């Protein structure tokens, strides 16, 4: 138990969510964003040992739990992946809400049907609900999150990528992370496992180039000023779904889930274009066939605050409240071990350059 | 309904070895090759759930433990990976020996500096030794395994791969698994991290073509009749090593370790060619810079039993016994769970199958 961490290993519809429940020292920071920055700046080897081979792998994802800081929250959470720390994550939020109830972190009131679980994240407060299985104490049927405010940021941004991709037109939207949203048709490849390595490559190229050429800034959270995810979308395979997508992020890893923050950013974009009404269910499919359900539950304009998309004819920037629903499973309870003489105590990747 | 398995998650110089220690269903079989066959044929969903995403991944490896059957063994063991089931595995044997002593599966005698751990495998009896740290009862510094007999099987086999590989010449050798051994240079790829996808692809196509064109058969073990592994070798980077290799196997996964059966195979080949002598240390490097040490312990002719390399005038085939030494670490104690309603209770891969047109 020398250097050890305890993990609730979960997945949300195929996407990993390794929830680290114990093992950290005190992490300085007066909010969750500072605690994230502390880990990144001072203890990044932890993320690497927990996320990467041999203990993890190139498409691993997870989070560290903390005591809540913000008033009203049940749990503090910092997300991590193979390349860095996202400000929010829908699939891991869904998993954390589920684990909080299944493992007893949060109590179930007698005869409750739904149990609130509020997450204090680097992007803000995420209000979750675990929907209980009919005849049970704490068995979770599925879980919903009300995301932090999402918004379209900038439209029809032309990004110049090298051959074979060339010029590509994207939207930038915020769904807890900044996304570039791009039709797969523009990249000349369809969403499939056959194309997954090219989709990864195309997503890395796109992210790199837009962060070079376009400076983004969340108007309410100064620390959010990069595009961290690329959402590549196209026509659905499952007739229950409106669209399919794959999100590329981290060290060009791919989300196996439909991506909760990416679903929020998509819904905000569609809502801004008049294509979704309040309460309307949007169903996003993943590369694996997984589904998430979203609804926009509210909109607001914020006078005197604008983003590049905001027209002069509008009073202020449009933001929306998105709810995302999906299902997570506990797939293990792990005690992770780090022997000081282990040459890969800090993990490794064989992913090309 | 709900299933759980306990795992000791290990790695051997970067290569996973997920050792399942309890929670398996009860499996028939009168030997470990039959238990492997029973799993393969009737309960392959266990391997898939345990090896593949989301609980594993495309380069995961492991083993199930059983009661020993063969006289003299401490543990029965069946190996598994992302494609199927290898008859032997050096790195996972080194991991099992290590874990056996470190977790008290086997006891350490009074003031012992070395502890035997014998494994009953689908390839035969593998005699291992945990080498202990100085002032400890059960801390392991490294572990050595004496493999089942290895041998060169067939020499200079030419097979034609698709473009861009074309015709390639290889040796077929048994080191607990049958290997095709090829120089990276013949494939026109350097062994490097940058080239790992290409190495995987060439390894898959070579394994497939070899099995199509050359029908192998272990002369003492009827159930071993395919080439399951491809060993691609080249010049060392570490000046302590003789060579560097990557082994492609499973669903074209790659060994991050130097590969213990592939070292045995390589040593049996070099030995057959007069390039390595009994007791001489051979050091093999992996793509990660990991090292294993190997030594030929002995040779033997088996009268009236021949393989293709055996000469008309030679009265029986040559076999060698190799010992391999490496180090394993415990990386996790895991309780792995499978909800009947989980659509990924049996795992998934996003790796695409490939084949020659
Ligand atoms: O669900 C999400 O928001 C997510 C982000 C990256 C991977 N999944
Ligand atoms: O060490 C070995 O023998 C091995 C075989 C496949 C992967 N590692």
Coordinates of N, CA, C and O in Angstrom, one line a residue, chain B residues 119-220:
Chain B
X119 N 4.9 -24.0 -12.5 CA 3.7 -23.7 -13.1 C 3.4 -24.8 -14.1 O 4.2 -25.3 -14.8
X120 N 2.1 -25.3 -14.1 CA 1.6 -26.3 -14.9 C 0.8 -25.5 -16.0 O -0.2 -24.9 -15.8
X121 N 1.4 -25.5 -17.2 CA 0.9 -24.7 -18.4 C 0.5 -25.6 -19.5 O 0.8 -26.8 -19.5
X122 N -0.3 -25.1 -20.4 CA -0.7 -25.8 -21.6 C 0.5 -26.3 -22.5 O 0.3 -27.2 -23.3
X123 N 1.7 -25.7 -22.4 CA 2.9 -26.2 -23.1 C 3.7 -27.1 -22.2 O 4.7 -27.6 -22.8
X124 N 3.3 -27.4 -21.0 CA 4.2 -28.2 -20.1 C 4.7 -27.4 -18.9 O 4.3 -26.3 -18.6
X125 N 5.5 -28.1 -18.1 CA 5.9 -27.8 -16.7 C 7.0 -26.7 -16.9 O 8.0 -26.9 -17.6
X126 N 6.8 -25.6 -16.2 CA 7.7 -24.5 -16.2 C 8.2 -24.3 -14.8 O 7.4 -23.9 -13.9
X127 N 9.5 -24.5 -14.6 CA 10.1 -24.4 -13.2 C 10.6 -23.0 -13.0 O 11.6 -22.6 -13.6
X128 N 10.0 -22.2 -12.1 CA 10.4 -20.9 -11.8 C 11.1 -20.8 -10.5 O 10.9 -21.6 -9.6
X129 N 11.8 -19.6 -10.3 CA 12.5 -19.3 -9.1 C 12.3 -17.8 -8.8 O 12.7 -17.0 -9.6
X130 N 11.7 -17.5 -7.7 CA 11.8 -16.1 -7.2 C 13.1 -15.9 -6.5 O 13.5 -16.6 -5.6
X131 N 13.9 -14.8 -7.0 CA 15.1 -14.5 -6.3 C 14.8 -13.4 -5.3 O 14.3 -12.3 -5.7
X132 N 15.1 -13.6 -4.1 CA 14.7 -12.7 -3.0 C 15.6 -11.5 -2.7 O 16.8 -11.6 -2.9
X133 N 15.1 -10.4 -2.3 CA 15.9 -9.3 -1.8 C 16.5 -9.6 -0.4 O 15.7 -9.9 0.5
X134 N 17.8 -9.6 -0.3 CA 18.7 -9.6 0.9 C 18.0 -9.9 2.2 O 18.0 -11.0 2.8
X135 N 17.4 -8.8 2.8 CA 17.0 -8.8 4.2 C 15.4 -8.8 4.1 O 14.8 -7.9 4.7
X136 N 14.9 -9.7 3.4 CA 13.4 -9.9 3.4 C 13.0 -11.3 3.3 O 13.7 -12.2 2.9
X137 N 11.8 -11.5 3.8 CA 11.2 -12.9 3.8 C 10.5 -13.1 2.4 O 10.6 -14.2 1.8
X138 N 9.9 -12.0 1.9 CA 9.1 -12.2 0.7 C 9.1 -11.1 -0.4 O 8.2 -11.0 -1.2
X139 N 10.2 -10.3 -0.3 CA 10.3 -9.3 -1.3 C 11.2 -9.8 -2.5 O 12.3 -10.4 -2.3
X140 N 10.7 -9.7 -3.7 CA 11.3 -10.4 -4.9 C 12.2 -9.4 -5.7 O 11.6 -8.3 -6.1
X141 N 13.5 -9.7 -5.9 CA 14.3 -8.8 -6.8 C 14.1 -9.0 -8.2 O 14.0 -8.1 -9.0
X142 N 14.0 -10.3 -8.6 CA 13.6 -10.7 -10.0 C 13.3 -12.2 -9.9 O 13.3 -12.8 -8.9
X143 N 12.9 -12.8 -11.1 CA 12.5 -14.1 -11.1 C 13.0 -14.7 -12.4 O 13.1 -14.0 -13.4
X144 N 13.2 -16.0 -12.4 CA 13.8 -16.7 -13.5 C 12.8 -17.9 -13.8 O 12.1 -18.3 -12.9
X145 N 12.6 -18.3 -15.1 CA 11.8 -19.5 -15.4 C 12.7 -20.4 -16.3 O 13.4 -19.9 -17.2
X146 N 12.7 -21.7 -16.0 CA 13.2 -22.7 -16.9 C 12.0 -23.1 -17.8 O 11.1 -23.8 -17.3
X147 N 12.1 -22.7 -19.1 CA 11.0 -23.0 -20.1 C 10.9 -24.5 -20.4 O 11.8 -25.2 -20.2
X148 N 9.7 -24.8 -21.0 CA 9.6 -26.1 -21.7 C 10.6 -26.2 -22.8 O 11.2 -25.1 -23.2
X149 N 11.0 -27.4 -23.3 CA 12.0 -27.5 -24.4 C 11.7 -26.6 -25.6 O 10.5 -26.6 -26.1
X150 N 12.7 -25.9 -26.1 CA 12.6 -25.1 -27.3 C 13.4 -25.7 -28.4 O 14.3 -26.5 -28.2
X151 N 13.1 -25.3 -29.6 CA 13.8 -25.8 -30.8 C 13.6 -25.0 -32.1 O 12.5 -24.6 -32.3
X152 N 14.6 -24.9 -32.9 CA 14.4 -24.5 -34.3 C 13.6 -25.7 -34.9 O 13.8 -26.9 -34.7
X153 N 12.6 -25.2 -35.7 CA 11.6 -26.1 -36.4 C 11.9 -26.2 -37.9 O 12.0 -27.3 -38.5
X154 N 12.0 -25.0 -38.5 CA 12.2 -24.9 -39.9 C 12.9 -23.6 -40.2 O 12.6 -22.6 -39.7
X155 N 13.9 -23.7 -41.1 CA 14.9 -22.7 -41.3 C 14.7 -22.1 -42.7 O 14.3 -22.8 -43.6
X156 N 14.9 -20.8 -42.9 CA 14.9 -20.1 -44.2 C 13.6 -20.3 -45.0 O 13.7 -20.6 -46.2
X157 N 12.5 -20.1 -44.3 CA 11.2 -20.3 -45.0 C 10.8 -19.0 -45.7 O 10.8 -17.9 -45.1
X158 N 10.6 -19.1 -47.0 CA 10.3 -17.8 -47.7 C 8.8 -17.7 -47.9 O 8.2 -18.7 -48.4
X159 N 8.2 -16.6 -47.5 CA 6.9 -16.4 -47.7 C 6.7 -15.0 -48.4 O 7.4 -14.0 -48.1
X160 N 5.6 -14.9 -49.2 CA 5.4 -13.7 -49.9 C 4.2 -13.0 -49.3 O 3.1 -13.5 -49.1
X161 N 4.5 -11.8 -48.8 CA 3.5 -10.9 -48.2 C 3.0 -9.9 -49.2 O 3.6 -9.7 -50.2
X162 N 1.8 -9.3 -49.0 CA 1.4 -8.2 -49.8 C 2.4 -7.1 -49.8 O 3.2 -6.9 -48.9
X163 N 2.3 -6.2 -50.9 CA 3.0 -4.9 -50.8 C 2.5 -4.1 -49.6 O 1.4 -4.2 -49.2
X164 N 3.4 -3.4 -49.0 CA 4.8 -3.1 -49.5 C 5.8 -4.1 -49.0 O 7.0 -3.8 -49.0
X165 N 5.5 -5.3 -48.5 CA 6.4 -6.2 -47.9 C 7.1 -7.1 -48.8 O 8.3 -7.3 -48.7
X166 N 6.3 -7.7 -49.7 CA 6.8 -8.7 -50.6 C 7.4 -9.9 -50.0 O 6.9 -10.3 -48.9
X167 N 8.4 -10.5 -50.6 CA 8.9 -11.7 -50.2 C 9.9 -11.5 -49.0 O 10.8 -10.6 -49.0
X168 N 9.8 -12.4 -48.0 CA 10.5 -12.3 -46.8 C 11.0 -13.7 -46.4 O 10.3 -14.7 -46.8
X169 N 12.2 -13.8 -45.8 CA 12.7 -15.1 -45.4 C 12.8 -15.2 -43.8 O 13.2 -14.2 -43.2
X170 N 12.3 -16.3 -43.3 CA 12.1 -16.4 -41.8 C 12.5 -17.7 -41.3 O 12.6 -18.6 -42.1
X171 N 12.7 -17.8 -40.0 CA 12.8 -19.1 -39.4 C 11.6 -19.3 -38.5 O 11.0 -18.4 -37.9
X172 N 11.2 -20.6 -38.4 CA 10.1 -21.0 -37.5 C 10.8 -21.8 -36.4 O 11.6 -22.7 -36.6
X173 N 10.5 -21.3 -35.1 CA 11.1 -21.9 -33.9 C 10.0 -22.0 -32.8 O 9.1 -21.1 -32.7
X174 N 10.1 -23.0 -32.0 CA 9.2 -23.1 -30.9 C 9.9 -22.7 -29.6 O 11.0 -23.1 -29.3
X175 N 9.2 -21.8 -28.9 CA 9.8 -21.4 -27.5 C 8.7 -21.4 -26.4 O 8.8 -20.7 -25.4
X176 N 7.7 -22.3 -26.6 CA 6.5 -22.4 -25.8 C 5.3 -22.1 -26.6 O 4.2 -22.6 -26.3
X177 N 5.5 -21.2 -27.6 CA 4.6 -20.9 -28.7 C 5.5 -21.1 -30.0 O 6.8 -20.9 -29.9
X178 N 4.9 -21.4 -31.1 CA 5.6 -21.3 -32.4 C 5.7 -19.9 -32.8 O 4.7 -19.2 -32.8
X179 N 6.9 -19.5 -33.2 CA 7.3 -18.1 -33.7 C 7.8 -18.2 -35.2 O 8.5 -19.1 -35.5
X180 N 7.4 -17.2 -36.0 CA 8.2 -16.8 -37.2 C 9.1 -15.7 -36.7 O 8.7 -14.7 -36.2
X181 N 10.4 -15.9 -36.9 CA 11.4 -15.0 -36.6 C 11.9 -14.3 -37.9 O 12.4 -14.9 -38.8
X182 N 11.8 -13.0 -37.9 CA 12.2 -12.2 -39.1 C 13.0 -10.9 -38.7 O 12.7 -10.3 -37.7
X183 N 14.0 -10.6 -39.5 CA 14.7 -9.3 -39.3 C 13.8 -8.1 -39.7 O 13.1 -8.2 -40.8
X184 N 13.7 -7.1 -38.9 CA 13.0 -5.8 -39.3 C 13.4 -5.3 -40.7 O 12.6 -4.8 -41.5
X185 N 14.7 -5.5 -40.9 CA 15.4 -5.1 -42.2 C 14.7 -5.7 -43.4 O 14.5 -5.0 -44.4
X186 N 14.2 -6.9 -43.3 CA 13.5 -7.6 -44.4 C 12.2 -7.0 -44.7 O 11.6 -7.1 -45.8
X187 N 11.6 -6.4 -43.7 CA 10.3 -5.7 -43.7 C 10.5 -4.3 -44.2 O 9.5 -3.6 -44.4
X188 N 11.7 -3.8 -44.2 CA 11.9 -2.4 -44.5 C 11.3 -1.4 -43.5 O 10.9 -0.3 -43.8
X189 N 11.3 -1.8 -42.2 CA 10.8 -1.0 -41.1 C 11.8 -1.1 -40.0 O 12.3 -2.1 -39.6
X190 N 12.2 0.1 -39.4 CA 13.0 0.0 -38.1 C 12.1 -0.2 -37.0 O 10.9 0.2 -36.9
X191 N 12.6 -0.9 -36.0 CA 11.9 -1.2 -34.8 C 12.0 0.1 -34.0 O 13.1 0.5 -33.5
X192 N 10.9 0.8 -33.9 CA 10.9 2.1 -33.2 C 9.4 2.3 -32.9 O 8.5 1.7 -33.5
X193 N 9.2 3.2 -31.9 CA 7.9 3.5 -31.4 C 7.1 4.1 -32.6 O 5.9 3.7 -32.8
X194 N 7.7 4.9 -33.3 CA 7.0 5.6 -34.5 C 6.4 4.5 -35.5 O 5.5 4.8 -36.2
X195 N 7.1 3.4 -35.6 CA 6.7 2.4 -36.6 C 5.8 1.2 -36.0 O 5.6 0.3 -36.7
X196 N 5.2 1.4 -34.9 CA 4.5 0.3 -34.2 C 3.2 -0.2 -35.0 O 3.0 -1.4 -35.1
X197 N 2.4 0.7 -35.5 CA 1.3 0.3 -36.4 C 1.7 -0.6 -37.6 O 1.1 -1.6 -37.9
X198 N 2.8 -0.1 -38.2 CA 3.3 -0.9 -39.4 C 3.8 -2.2 -38.9 O 3.7 -3.2 -39.6
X199 N 4.5 -2.2 -37.8 CA 5.0 -3.5 -37.2 C 3.9 -4.5 -36.9 O 4.0 -5.7 -37.2
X200 N 2.8 -4.0 -36.4 CA 1.7 -4.8 -36.1 C 1.0 -5.4 -37.4 O 0.7 -6.5 -37.4
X201 N 0.9 -4.5 -38.4 CA 0.3 -4.9 -39.6 C 1.2 -6.0 -40.3 O 0.6 -7.0 -40.7
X202 N 2.5 -5.8 -40.4 CA 3.4 -6.8 -41.0 C 3.4 -8.1 -40.2 O 3.4 -9.2 -40.8
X203 N 3.3 -8.0 -38.9 CA 3.3 -9.1 -38.0 C 2.0 -10.0 -38.2 O 2.1 -11.2 -38.2
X204 N 0.9 -9.4 -38.3 CA -0.4 -10.0 -38.6 C -0.4 -10.7 -40.0 O -0.7 -11.9 -40.1
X205 N 0.0 -10.0 -41.0 CA 0.1 -10.5 -42.4 C 1.1 -11.7 -42.5 O 0.8 -12.7 -43.2
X206 N 2.2 -11.6 -41.8 CA 3.1 -12.7 -41.8 C 2.6 -13.9 -41.0 O 2.7 -15.0 -41.5
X207 N 2.0 -13.7 -39.9 CA 1.4 -14.8 -39.1 C 0.4 -15.5 -40.0 O 0.4 -16.8 -40.1
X208 N -0.5 -14.8 -40.7 CA -1.5 -15.4 -41.5 C -1.0 -16.2 -42.7 O -1.4 -17.3 -42.9
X209 N 0.0 -15.6 -43.4 CA 0.6 -16.2 -44.6 C 1.3 -17.4 -44.2 O 1.2 -18.4 -44.9
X210 N 2.1 -17.4 -43.2 CA 2.9 -18.5 -42.7 C 1.9 -19.7 -42.4 O 2.2 -20.8 -42.8
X211 N 0.9 -19.4 -41.6 CA -0.1 -20.5 -41.3 C -0.8 -21.1 -42.6 O -1.2 -22.2 -42.6
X212 N -1.0 -20.2 -43.6 CA -1.6 -20.7 -44.8 C -0.7 -21.6 -45.5 O -1.2 -22.6 -46.1
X213 N 0.6 -21.2 -45.6 CA 1.6 -21.9 -46.4 C 2.5 -23.0 -45.7 O 3.0 -23.9 -46.4
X214 N 2.6 -22.9 -44.4 CA 3.4 -23.9 -43.7 C 2.5 -24.4 -42.6 O 2.1 -23.7 -41.7
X215 N 2.3 -25.7 -42.6 CA 1.5 -26.4 -41.6 C 2.4 -27.0 -40.5 O 3.0 -28.1 -40.8
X216 N 2.5 -26.4 -39.3 CA 3.4 -26.8 -38.3 C 2.8 -27.8 -37.3 O 1.6 -27.7 -37.2
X217 N 3.6 -28.6 -36.6 CA 3.0 -29.5 -35.6 C 4.1 -29.8 -34.6 O 5.1 -30.3 -34.9
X218 N 3.8 -29.5 -33.3 CA 4.7 -29.7 -32.3 C 4.8 -31.2 -32.2 O 3.7 -31.9 -32.1
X219 N 5.9 -31.9 -32.3 CA 6.0 -33.3 -32.4 C 5.7 -34.1 -31.1 O 5.4 -35.2 -31.1
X220 N 5.6 -33.4 -29.9 CA 5.2 -34.1 -28.7 C 3.8 -33.6 -28.2 O 3.2 -34.3 -27.3

